[PDB]
Assembly symmetry: C2
Homo-oligomer: 130 residues x 2
């Protein structure tokens, strides 16, 4: 549907992540999504491993949406990401301290579902705290 | 402003990238407010500090080029995803130049008033370049 409807879907999924509502977290993703990071396509299996390692280290991660823009079939978001270092990350034992990183996400929609996704992630503020 | 202002802002952003790549600095700077507010990593970066960052970066990467991968515009804002490419020709962090090509990725957001950028936000992933130094 419209850009405003797609924007609402993206905000709903982020809100569902923070509030722990799994139904809402996955509701608007297509089963066949193509992901991109650093100008390469990231196979979905590699994306899963990324998420697994990240959630082991940062299980309480939260997403603070700083802006969202939508036009035609695309939505872009800027997100401040915060977590506590509670599990090992790259075999570094948890510090139990809060960490931050920053992302920009872009989503392409078809029929109300995200079919393609791009990210730009600045992990440096977190890596400095390891 | 009017309903086609977003399209105009998008055009201006693309014109500024094209001006950068062709070496016409005034085609970039014409559309920025002198009182622009820059944000990076959830802090405001003073304009003088942004200039110093650019000076340091261009010393290392004097031929930097900007490849727009996406641009979106809505109301008074424009977002761009850009692939940044350069050759490591000068010192960076006191590491001698490798003379090899490097790449990093940015996501930029611009807020316009009357055709000028008055606020700017970035998210920059330098890691693909840092891994090659």
């Amino acid at each position: 549907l419209t850009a405003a409807d797609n924007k609402k879907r993206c905000l709903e999924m982020v809100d569902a992540w923070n509030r722990g509502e799994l139904g809402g977290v996955t509701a608007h993703w297509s089963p066949d999504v193509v992901h991109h990071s650093e100008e390469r396509i990231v196979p979905n299996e590699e994306m899963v491993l990324r998420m697994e390692s990240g959630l082991t280290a940062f299980p309480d991660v939260r997403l603070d949406v700083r802006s969202v823009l939508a036009e035609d079939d695309r939505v872009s978001m800027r997100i401040s990401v915060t977590a506590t270092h509670k599990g090992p990350f790259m075999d570094i034992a948890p510090t139990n301290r809060t960490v931050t990183w920053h992302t920009a996400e872009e989503f392409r929609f078809v029929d109300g579902k995200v079919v393609e996704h791009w990210d730009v992630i600045n992990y440096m503020p977190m890596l400095r705290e390891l």
